[PDB]
Protein backbone atom coordinates (compact mmCIF):
# COMPACT_ATOMS: atom_id res chain seq x y z
CA UNK A 1 0.00 0.00 0.00
CA UNK A 2 0.80 1.30 -2.52
CA UNK A 3 3.14 -0.90 -4.60
CA UNK A 4 4.67 0.50 -7.81
CA UNK A 5 4.88 -1.93 -10.75
CA UNK A 6 6.29 -1.73 -14.26
CA UNK A 7 4.95 -4.08 -16.94
CA UNK A 8 6.77 -4.16 -20.26
CA UNK A 9 5.37 -5.47 -23.54
CA UNK A 10 7.67 -5.88 -26.55
CA UNK A 11 7.10 -2.23 -27.59
CA UNK A 12 5.59 -0.43 -24.56
CA UNK A 13 6.35 0.36 -20.93
CA UNK A 14 3.38 0.47 -18.56
CA UNK A 15 3.28 1.92 -15.04
CA UNK A 16 0.67 0.74 -12.56
CA UNK A 17 0.16 0.52 -8.80
CA UNK A 18 -1.03 -2.49 -6.81
CA UNK A 19 -2.27 -3.30 -3.30
CA UNK A 20 -1.08 -6.21 -1.06
CA UNK A 21 -4.29 -8.08 -2.04
CA UNK A 22 -3.89 -7.63 -5.82
CA UNK A 23 -4.05 -10.99 -7.61
CA UNK A 24 -1.96 -12.06 -10.62
CA UNK A 25 -5.22 -12.13 -12.60
CA UNK A 26 -5.93 -8.47 -11.76
CA UNK A 27 -2.57 -7.12 -12.91
CA UNK A 28 -2.85 -9.32 -16.01
CA UNK A 29 -6.34 -8.06 -16.84
CA UNK A 30 -5.22 -4.44 -16.44
CA UNK A 31 -2.33 -4.93 -18.91
CA UNK A 32 -4.79 -6.52 -21.35
CA UNK A 33 -7.28 -3.64 -20.90
CA UNK A 34 -4.52 -1.03 -21.41
CA UNK A 35 -3.10 -2.74 -24.51
CA UNK A 36 -6.54 -3.66 -25.93
CA UNK A 37 -5.62 -7.30 -26.56
CA UNK A 38 -8.37 -9.96 -26.69
CA UNK A 39 -6.41 -13.13 -27.57
CA UNK A 40 -5.38 -13.34 -23.90
CA UNK A 41 -4.95 -17.12 -23.80
CA UNK A 42 -1.42 -17.02 -25.28
CA UNK A 43 0.08 -14.64 -22.75
CA UNK A 44 1.33 -14.31 -19.19
CA UNK A 45 3.56 -12.19 -17.01
CA UNK A 46 7.19 -12.94 -16.20
CA UNK A 47 9.07 -11.85 -13.12
CA UNK A 48 12.45 -12.41 -11.50
CA UNK A 49 12.27 -13.88 -7.98
CA UNK A 50 14.56 -13.11 -5.00
CA UNK A 51 16.80 -16.03 -6.01
CA UNK A 52 17.25 -14.61 -9.53
CA UNK A 53 15.14 -17.07 -11.53
CA UNK A 54 12.75 -16.04 -14.31
CA UNK A 55 9.29 -17.26 -13.32
CA UNK A 56 5.81 -17.11 -14.82
CA UNK A 57 3.41 -15.25 -12.52
CA UNK A 58 0.49 -17.31 -11.20
CA UNK A 59 -2.82 -15.56 -11.87
CA UNK A 60 -5.12 -17.07 -9.22
CA UNK A 61 -2.67 -15.94 -6.52
CA UNK A 62 -1.64 -12.65 -4.86
CA UNK A 63 1.30 -10.82 -6.47
CA UNK A 64 2.89 -10.07 -3.06
CA UNK A 65 2.84 -13.78 -2.15
CA UNK A 66 4.99 -15.00 -5.05
CA UNK A 67 8.45 -13.81 -3.92
CA UNK A 68 8.88 -11.14 -6.60
CA UNK A 69 12.30 -9.46 -6.42
CA UNK A 70 11.92 -6.52 -4.03
CA UNK A 71 12.61 -3.29 -5.96
CA UNK A 72 10.95 0.04 -6.80
CA UNK A 73 9.06 -0.63 -9.03
CA UNK A 74 8.48 -4.39 -9.36
CA UNK A 75 9.44 -5.52 -12.88
CA UNK A 76 7.21 -7.57 -15.22
CA UNK A 77 7.38 -8.73 -18.84
CA UNK A 78 4.17 -9.35 -20.79
CA UNK A 79 5.04 -12.19 -23.18
CA UNK A 80 3.51 -15.06 -25.15
CA UNK A 81 3.69 -18.30 -23.17
CA UNK A 82 1.84 -20.31 -25.82
CA UNK A 83 2.01 -20.29 -29.59
CA UNK A 84 -0.74 -20.99 -32.14
CA UNK A 85 -0.54 -23.97 -34.50
CA UNK A 86 -0.99 -21.48 -37.34
CA UNK A 87 -0.44 -17.71 -37.13
CA UNK A 88 -2.74 -16.87 -40.07
CA UNK A 89 -5.81 -18.52 -38.56
CA UNK A 90 -5.36 -17.66 -34.88
CA UNK A 91 -3.74 -14.22 -34.64
CA UNK A 92 -6.70 -12.04 -35.63
CA UNK A 93 -5.94 -8.64 -34.02
CA UNK A 94 -2.99 -6.55 -35.22
CA UNK A 95 -1.75 -5.98 -31.65
CA UNK A 96 -1.48 -9.76 -31.19
CA UNK A 97 0.35 -9.98 -34.53
CA UNK A 98 2.75 -7.16 -33.59
CA UNK A 99 3.54 -8.56 -30.11
CA UNK A 100 4.20 -12.04 -31.60
CA UNK A 101 6.29 -10.68 -34.48
CA UNK A 102 8.46 -8.69 -32.05
CA UNK A 103 8.93 -11.56 -29.54
CA UNK A 104 9.79 -14.15 -32.24
CA UNK A 105 12.19 -11.76 -34.03
CA UNK A 106 14.02 -11.15 -30.74
CA UNK A 107 14.35 -14.91 -30.12
CA UNK A 108 15.73 -15.40 -33.65
CA UNK A 109 18.26 -12.56 -33.27
CA UNK A 110 19.30 -13.81 -29.80
CA UNK A 111 20.07 -17.21 -31.41
CA UNK A 112 17.40 -18.89 -29.23
CA UNK A 113 15.47 -20.11 -32.27
CA UNK A 114 17.87 -21.53 -34.85
CA UNK A 115 17.62 -19.97 -38.31
CA UNK A 116 19.78 -20.79 -41.36
CA UNK A 117 21.44 -17.89 -43.28
CA UNK A 118 19.26 -17.47 -46.42
CA UNK A 119 16.06 -17.64 -44.35
CA UNK A 120 17.54 -15.20 -41.80
CA UNK A 121 18.32 -12.73 -44.60
CA UNK A 122 14.78 -13.09 -45.97
CA UNK A 123 13.35 -12.66 -42.46
CA UNK A 124 15.48 -9.53 -41.89
CA UNK A 125 14.11 -8.30 -45.20
CA UNK A 126 10.52 -8.41 -43.89
CA UNK A 127 11.57 -6.72 -40.65
CA UNK A 128 13.10 -3.93 -42.77
CA UNK A 129 9.93 -3.63 -44.86
CA UNK A 130 7.87 -3.46 -41.62
CA UNK A 131 10.08 -0.76 -40.08
CA UNK A 132 11.09 1.27 -43.13
CA UNK A 133 8.20 0.94 -45.58
CA UNK A 134 8.85 0.81 -49.34
CA UNK A 135 12.43 0.95 -50.55
CA UNK A 136 13.35 4.46 -51.72
CA UNK A 137 16.60 5.24 -53.55
CA UNK A 138 16.53 8.88 -52.40
CA UNK A 139 16.23 8.03 -48.67
CA UNK A 140 17.80 4.55 -48.43
CA UNK A 141 21.27 5.22 -49.80
CA UNK A 142 23.95 2.58 -49.00
CA UNK A 143 24.65 2.34 -45.26
CA UNK A 144 21.00 2.95 -44.26
CA UNK A 145 20.87 -0.37 -42.36
CA UNK A 146 24.06 0.16 -40.34
CA UNK A 147 22.19 0.88 -37.09
CA UNK A 148 19.82 -2.10 -37.36
CA UNK A 149 20.26 -5.49 -35.69
CA UNK A 150 19.17 -7.67 -38.60
CA UNK A 151 20.87 -11.06 -38.41
CA UNK A 152 21.48 -13.68 -35.72
CA UNK A 153 25.06 -13.73 -34.38
CA UNK A 154 25.38 -17.37 -35.52
CA UNK A 155 25.01 -16.12 -39.13
CA UNK A 156 27.46 -13.19 -38.82
CA UNK A 157 30.26 -15.53 -37.65
CA UNK A 158 30.05 -18.52 -40.03
CA UNK A 159 30.55 -16.59 -43.25
CA UNK A 160 33.28 -14.53 -44.91
CA UNK A 161 30.74 -11.80 -45.74
CA UNK A 162 31.28 -8.35 -44.20
CA UNK A 163 28.55 -6.51 -42.28
CA UNK A 164 28.05 -4.21 -45.30
CA UNK A 165 27.81 -7.16 -47.72
CA UNK A 166 25.11 -8.70 -45.50
CA UNK A 167 23.30 -5.34 -45.52
CA UNK A 168 23.48 -5.33 -49.33
CA UNK A 169 21.94 -8.83 -49.45
CA UNK A 170 19.12 -7.63 -47.16
CA UNK A 171 18.65 -4.41 -49.19
CA UNK A 172 18.29 -6.51 -52.36
CA UNK A 173 15.33 -8.40 -50.84
CA UNK A 174 13.80 -5.24 -49.32
CA UNK A 175 13.57 -3.62 -52.78
CA UNK A 176 11.43 -6.58 -53.90
CA UNK A 177 8.78 -6.08 -51.18
CA UNK A 178 7.67 -2.76 -52.75
CA UNK A 179 3.98 -2.33 -51.85
CA UNK A 180 3.84 -4.59 -48.80
CA UNK A 181 2.08 -3.08 -45.78
CA UNK A 182 3.47 -3.28 -42.23
CA UNK A 183 0.85 -5.77 -40.98
CA UNK A 184 1.31 -8.07 -43.99
CA UNK A 185 5.09 -7.81 -43.68
CA UNK A 186 4.96 -8.89 -40.02
CA UNK A 187 2.63 -11.78 -40.92
CA UNK A 188 4.90 -12.92 -43.75
CA UNK A 189 7.80 -12.97 -41.26
CA UNK A 190 5.71 -15.02 -38.83
CA UNK A 191 4.59 -17.51 -41.51
CA UNK A 192 8.21 -18.26 -42.39
CA UNK A 193 9.32 -18.32 -38.76
CA UNK A 194 6.63 -20.76 -37.58
CA UNK A 195 8.04 -23.46 -39.88
CA UNK A 196 11.46 -23.28 -38.22
CA UNK A 197 12.19 -26.51 -36.34
CA UNK A 198 12.91 -24.75 -33.00
CA UNK A 199 9.95 -22.35 -33.24
CA UNK A 200 7.36 -22.58 -30.46
CA UNK A 201 9.10 -25.37 -28.54
CA UNK A 202 10.16 -25.22 -24.91
CA UNK A 203 13.33 -27.28 -24.36
CA UNK A 204 14.23 -28.97 -21.05
CA UNK A 205 17.23 -31.04 -19.88
CA UNK A 206 15.96 -34.63 -19.58
CA UNK A 207 17.10 -38.23 -18.85
CA UNK A 208 16.17 -41.86 -19.59
CA UNK A 209 16.68 -45.00 -17.43
CA UNK A 210 20.31 -45.38 -18.56
CA UNK A 211 20.92 -41.77 -17.45
CA UNK A 212 21.45 -40.50 -21.00
CA UNK A 213 21.07 -36.73 -21.32
CA UNK A 214 18.36 -35.73 -23.82
CA UNK A 215 16.02 -32.85 -24.66
CA UNK A 216 12.30 -32.74 -23.99
CA UNK A 217 10.27 -30.51 -26.30
CA UNK A 218 6.88 -29.12 -25.31
CA UNK A 219 4.91 -27.37 -28.06
CA UNK A 220 1.46 -26.77 -29.62
CA UNK A 221 1.31 -30.21 -31.23
CA UNK A 222 2.61 -32.36 -28.35
CA UNK A 223 5.76 -33.74 -26.76
CA UNK A 224 9.04 -34.54 -28.54
CA UNK A 225 12.33 -36.17 -27.55
CA UNK A 226 15.58 -34.86 -29.05
CA UNK A 227 19.12 -36.17 -28.85
CA UNK A 228 21.29 -33.88 -26.76
CA UNK A 229 23.22 -32.28 -29.62
CA UNK A 230 20.35 -31.98 -32.13
CA UNK A 231 17.44 -29.75 -31.11
CA UNK A 232 16.22 -29.65 -34.75
CA UNK A 233 15.35 -33.34 -35.19
CA UNK A 234 12.57 -34.98 -33.18
CA UNK A 235 13.43 -38.62 -32.50
CA UNK A 236 10.22 -39.66 -30.71
CA UNK A 237 6.88 -37.79 -30.72
CA UNK A 238 3.89 -37.68 -28.36
CA UNK A 239 0.93 -35.88 -29.99
CA UNK A 240 -1.58 -34.36 -27.55
CA UNK A 241 -4.38 -36.57 -28.92
CA UNK A 242 -2.48 -39.67 -27.70
CA UNK A 243 -2.05 -38.38 -24.12
CA UNK A 244 -4.35 -39.05 -21.15
CA UNK A 245 -2.37 -37.67 -18.20
CA UNK A 246 0.89 -35.95 -17.26
CA UNK A 247 2.24 -35.79 -13.70
CA UNK A 248 5.55 -35.61 -11.85
CA UNK A 249 6.88 -36.53 -8.43
CA UNK A 250 10.26 -35.36 -7.11
CA UNK A 251 12.25 -36.00 -10.31
CA UNK A 252 10.13 -38.48 -12.31
CA UNK A 253 7.58 -37.61 -15.01
CA UNK A 254 4.88 -40.13 -15.93
CA UNK A 255 2.93 -39.79 -19.17
CA UNK A 256 -0.16 -42.00 -19.37
CA UNK A 257 -1.61 -42.80 -22.82
CA UNK A 258 -5.19 -42.79 -24.15
CA UNK A 259 -4.91 -46.42 -25.34
CA UNK A 260 -4.89 -47.82 -21.75
CA UNK A 261 -3.60 -51.09 -23.24
CA UNK A 262 -0.30 -49.26 -23.83
CA UNK A 263 2.71 -48.85 -21.47
CA UNK A 264 3.43 -45.68 -19.49
CA UNK A 265 6.19 -43.41 -20.78
CA UNK A 266 8.48 -42.15 -18.01
CA UNK A 267 11.44 -39.77 -17.92
CA UNK A 268 13.53 -37.88 -15.36
CA UNK A 269 13.97 -34.13 -14.85
CA UNK A 270 16.30 -32.75 -12.12
CA UNK A 271 14.78 -29.49 -10.79
CA UNK A 272 11.40 -28.92 -9.08
CA UNK A 273 11.31 -25.27 -10.16
CA UNK A 274 11.68 -26.37 -13.79
CA UNK A 275 9.27 -29.34 -13.49
CA UNK A 276 6.43 -27.06 -12.38
CA UNK A 277 6.91 -25.03 -15.58
CA UNK A 278 7.02 -28.26 -17.63
CA UNK A 279 3.73 -29.43 -16.10
CA UNK A 280 2.02 -26.04 -16.63
CA UNK A 281 3.15 -25.83 -20.27
CA UNK A 282 1.83 -29.33 -21.00
CA UNK A 283 -1.60 -28.61 -19.49
CA UNK A 284 -1.93 -25.27 -21.31
CA UNK A 285 -0.73 -26.62 -24.66
CA UNK A 286 -3.06 -29.60 -24.24
CA UNK A 287 -6.10 -27.43 -23.38
CA UNK A 288 -5.53 -25.08 -26.34
CA UNK A 289 -5.06 -28.11 -28.62
CA UNK A 290 -8.50 -29.48 -27.68
CA UNK A 291 -10.27 -26.10 -27.97
CA UNK A 292 -9.18 -25.77 -31.63
CA UNK A 293 -10.88 -29.11 -32.40
CA UNK A 294 -14.05 -28.44 -30.36
CA UNK A 295 -15.27 -24.88 -30.99
CA UNK B 1 6.28 -33.18 -44.89
CA UNK B 2 7.09 -30.89 -41.93
CA UNK B 3 9.83 -31.75 -39.39
CA UNK B 4 7.75 -34.11 -37.24
CA UNK B 5 8.83 -37.22 -35.31
CA UNK B 6 8.80 -40.67 -37.00
CA UNK B 7 5.55 -42.62 -36.50
CA UNK B 8 5.36 -45.53 -34.01
CA UNK B 9 3.24 -47.06 -31.21
CA UNK B 10 3.86 -46.41 -27.49
CA UNK B 11 5.77 -49.67 -26.90
CA UNK B 12 8.10 -48.79 -29.78
CA UNK B 13 8.46 -45.28 -28.32
CA UNK B 14 9.64 -46.71 -24.98
CA UNK B 15 12.10 -49.16 -26.57
CA UNK B 16 13.63 -46.40 -28.72
CA UNK B 17 13.76 -43.93 -25.81
CA UNK B 18 15.27 -46.44 -23.38
CA UNK B 19 18.53 -46.89 -25.33
CA UNK B 20 19.04 -43.52 -27.08
- Do A208 and B18 touch, CB atoms closer than 8 A? yes
Where are chain A's structural domains? 2-80, 81-197, 199-289
Q: With an 8 Å Cβ cutoff, are B3 and A259 in contact?
A: no
Contact A13, A6 (CB under 8 A): yes
Rounded to 5 degrees, what are φ and ψ at A58?
Answer: -85, 130
Nearest one of A152, A84, A113, A103 to A232, comparing CA atoms: A113
Q: Are A116 and A23 in contact (CB under 8 A)?
A: no
**Residue A210 is nearest to which of B4, B6, B19, comparing CB atoms?**
B19
Within an 8 Å CB–CB cutoff, is residue B1 touching chain A?
no
Query: Residue A230 is inside which H or E element, if any?
Result: none
Selecting from 2.60.40.1760, 3.10.20.90, 3.30.365.10, 3.40.50.300, what CATH number does the domain A2-80 have? Answer: 3.10.20.90
- Determine which helix (DSSP H) or strand (DSSP E) holds A42, and give its type and residue range: none
- From chain B, the residues in CB contact with A212 under 8 A are 20
Which of A197, A232, A236 is facing B13, going by the closest CB pair? A236
The reply to whether domains A81-197 and A199-289 share a CATH topology is no
Which CATH number does A199-289 carry?
2.30.29.30
Residues in B touching A237 (Cβ below 8 Å): 4-7
Burial of A186 (0-12, 13-18, 19+ CB in 10 A): buried
Q: Please, which residues bridge with residue A16 across strands?
A: A5
Is the CB of residue A200 less than 8 Å from the CB of residue A220?
A: yes
Tell me how far the alpha carbon of residue A292 is from its chain's centroid.
Answer: 20
Partners of residue B4 in chain A, C-beta under 8 Å:
221, 234, 237
Q: Class for domain A81-197, per CATH?
A: mainly alpha
Q: What does the alpha-carbon distance between residue A111 and residue A25 come to, in Å, rounded to a whole number?
A: 32
Amino acid sequence: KPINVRVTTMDAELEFAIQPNTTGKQLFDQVVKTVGLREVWFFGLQYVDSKGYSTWLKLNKKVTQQDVKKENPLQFKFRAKFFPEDVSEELIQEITQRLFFLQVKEAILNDEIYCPPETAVLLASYAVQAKYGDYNKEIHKPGYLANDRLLPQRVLEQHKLTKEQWEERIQNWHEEHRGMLREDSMMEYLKIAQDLEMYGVNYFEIKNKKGTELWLGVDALGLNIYEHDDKLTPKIGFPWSEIRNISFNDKKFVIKPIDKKAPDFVFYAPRLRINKRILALCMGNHELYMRRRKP
Amino acid sequence: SSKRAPQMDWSKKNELFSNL
